[PDB]
Amino acid sequence: GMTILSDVAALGQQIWLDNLSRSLVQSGELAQMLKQGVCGVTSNPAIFQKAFAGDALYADEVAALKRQNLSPKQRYETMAVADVRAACDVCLAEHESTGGKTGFVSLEVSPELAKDAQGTVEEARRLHAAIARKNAMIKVPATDAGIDALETLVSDGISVNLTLLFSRAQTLKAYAAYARGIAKRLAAGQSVAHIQVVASFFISRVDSALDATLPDRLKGKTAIALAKAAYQDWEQYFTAPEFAALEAQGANRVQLLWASTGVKNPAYPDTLYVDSLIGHTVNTVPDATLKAFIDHGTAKATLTESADEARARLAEIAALGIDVETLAARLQEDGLKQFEEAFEKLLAPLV
Numbered sequence: 001g002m003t004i005l006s007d008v009a010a011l012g013q014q015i016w017l018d019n020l021s022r023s024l025v026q027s028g029e030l031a032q033m034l035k036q037g038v039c040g041v042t043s044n045p046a047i048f049q050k051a052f053a054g055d056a057l058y059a060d061e062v063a064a065l066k067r068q069n070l071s072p073k074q075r076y077e078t079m080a081v082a083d084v085r086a087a088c089d090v091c092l093a094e095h096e097s098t099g100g101k102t103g104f105v106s107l108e109v110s111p112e113l114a115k116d117a118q119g120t121v122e123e124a125r126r127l128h129a130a131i132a133r134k135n136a137m138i139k140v141p142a143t144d145a146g147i148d149a150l151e152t153l154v155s156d157g158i159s160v161n162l163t164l165l166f167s168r169a170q171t172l173k174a175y176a177a178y179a180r181g182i183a184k185r186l187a188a189g190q191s192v193a194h195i196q197v198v199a200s201f202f203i204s205r206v207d208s209a210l211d212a213t214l215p216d217r218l219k220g221k222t223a224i225a226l227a228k229a230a231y232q233d234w235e236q237y238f239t240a241p242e243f244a245a246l247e248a249q250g251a252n253r254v255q256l257l258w259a260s261t262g263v264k265n266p267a268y269p270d271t272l273y274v275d276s277l278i279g280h281t282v283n284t285v286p287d288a289t290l291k292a293f294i295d296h297g298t299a300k301a302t303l304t305e306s307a308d309e310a311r312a313r314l315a316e317i318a319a320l321g322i323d324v325e326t327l328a329a330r331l332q333e334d335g336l337k338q339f340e341e342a343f344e345k346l347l348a349p350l351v
Contacts, residue, residue: 001294002036002037002294003037004037004293004294004297004298004299005036005037005038005294006037007299008037008278008299009037009039011278011279011299011300011301012279012280012281013278013279013281013282013283014039014040014102014281014282014283015037015038015039015282015283015284015285015290015293016038016039016040016041016042016104016257016282016283016284016285017030017033017038017040017041017042017284017285017287017290018042018047018259018261018262018284018285018286019041019043019047019051019286019287020041020042020043020047020048020051020083020084020087020105021051021054021055021057021083022051022055022057022058022061022079022082022083022086023055023056023057024087025083025086025087025090026057026086030087030090030091031090034090034091034093034094034103038290039094039102039103040091040102040103040104040105040106040282040284041087041091041104041105041106042105042106042139042161042200042259042284043080043083043084043105043106043107043108043139044108044139044163044339044342045108045111045339045340045342045343045346046338046339046342048076048079048080048342048346049342049343049345049346051083052076052079052346052349053346053349058079061078061079061082062075062079062349062350065078065079065350066350072347072348072350072351073110073347075350076346076347076350077127077130080107081107081127081130081131084105084107084131084133084136085131085132085133087105088105088131088133088135088136089133091103091104091105091135092133092134092135095134095135099193100134100135100193100194100196101196101252103135104135104136104137104159104161104196104198105133105135105136105137106136106137106138106139106161107127107131107136107137107138107139108138108139108140108141108161108163108339109123109124109127109138109139109140110123110343111141111336111339111340111343112340114141114143114145114146114336115143115144115145116145117145117146117148117149117152120140120145120146120149121149121152121153124138124140124149124153124158124160125153125156125158128158134194136159137159137160137161137196137198138153138158138159138160138161139160139161139162139163139200140153140160140161140162140163141162141163141164141332141335141336142162142163142164142165142170142171142174142199142332143164143332143336146162147162147170147173147174147177148177150162150174150177150178150181150197151177151178151180151181151184152181153181154177154178154181154182154185154195154197155180155181155184155185157185157190157191157194157195158195159194159195159196159197160197160198161197161198161200161257162174162197162198162199162200163200163259164200164202164331164332164335164336165199165200165201165202165328165332166201166202166205166206166226166327166328166329166331166332167324167325167328167329167332168226168229168230168233168324169325169328170328170332171199171201171230171233171234171256172233172237174199174254175199175234175237175238175254178197178254179242179243179246182195182246182251183246186246186249186251191250192246192249192250192251192252193250193251193252195251195252196252196255197252197254197255198254198255198256198257198282199254199255199256199257200257200258200259200284201226201227201230201256201257201258201259202259202260202331202335203223203224203227203258203259203260203261203273203277204223204260204261204262204263204264204273205223205260205331205335206222206223206226206327206331207219207220207221207222207223207264207265207268208264208265209327209330209331210222210317210322210327211265214320215316215320218313218316218317219267220265220267220268220272221313222313222314222317222324223273224272224273224276224277224310225309225310225311225313225314225317226310226314226324227256227258227277227303228303228304228306228307228310229307229310229311229314230256231256231279231281231303231304232304232307234253234254234256238253238254253280255280255281255282256280256281256282257281257282257283257284258273258277258281258282258283258284259284261273261274261277261283261284261285261286261289262285262286262288262289263289270288270289270292271289271292271293271296271297271298273289274289274293274297275293275297275298275300275302276302276303277302277303278299278300278301278302278303279301279302279303279304281303
């Protein structure tokens with residue numbers, strides 16, 4: 001039942017909605033979710049492509065924007081920034097209630113910038129200013145250029161959702177970049193207590209890539225094992241003396257955020273990823289997964305259970321010749337291609 005969302009919050013995990021649309025906000029639905037256990041919102045170019053194609057409330061906005069001398073990208077951005085502003089306004093009471101720890105809405109930069117650190121910084125600063133809300137996160141792919149950009153954006157005081165993580169090594173690089181940006185602010189006498197960063201680590205796409213060729217005892221296990229090991233890495237990094245010296249001065253830890261948590265194989269229960277990954281974390285879920293979890297999910301502190309088994313599974317994955325770092329790079333590049341495809345699909349009707 002609905003109170004499962006509050007049970008998960010008491011275990012220290014925020015549940016966010018991995019969807020956004022003009023009608024979700026205008027209907028009052030988002031505001032009602034925010035009073036009842038949903039604590040934030042994520043978007044991406046695929047989410048916007050589907051919303052723009054299906055939500056009747058965009059039609060008048062598109063017609064208005066087609067009367068102006070605007071590029072397709074600026075028409076899209078005007079639409080998306082408006083949705084994000086409106087959602088931020090709905091989420092603001094929640095965000096302020098926790099001292100700025102919850103109640104975020106994320107907007108992703110253009111996929112074409114993913115390997116361009118400077119261009120990413122420029123666009124992220126611009127979108128942060130355009131939204132003009134303290135509870136907006138700019139969503140940046142965790143390429144090497146994205147991690148360069150993360151350090152700069154943190155040093156500029158901007159909250160960031162670093163996305164398309166599939167690698168424990170790349171996640172640790174992101175933490176180090178974050179810490180460098182925080183240290184820069186502290187050395188400049190600037191505030192850090194408002195800066196929030198999440199590391200969005202993708203789940204289902206790992207199992208989708210591997211399961212058809214894995215031995216039986218590993219099918220449907222790899223993504224969860226990677227996430228469990230990533231969380232162990234997180235505990236170790238953020239409790240170490242180096243980060244503790246920053247946290248003592250007001251820095252916030254990065255938090256892991258489980259994304260791609262809709263189940264994609266009907267051989268697995270639809271609540272598998274949400275149920276299995278609860279532990280200072282976030283899980284962003286599509287509508288149908290939120291539905292399923294409310295109906296028949298389980299709230300238990302599962303993320304840290306049986307870490308020994310997670311390690312043994314990852315050792316067997318390596319024994320089989322699956323290099324999870326090679327896999328992560330491929331999945332990140334595939335995800336960027338796919339987001340670019342979705343973005344080009346959404347731009348075409350805006351010409």
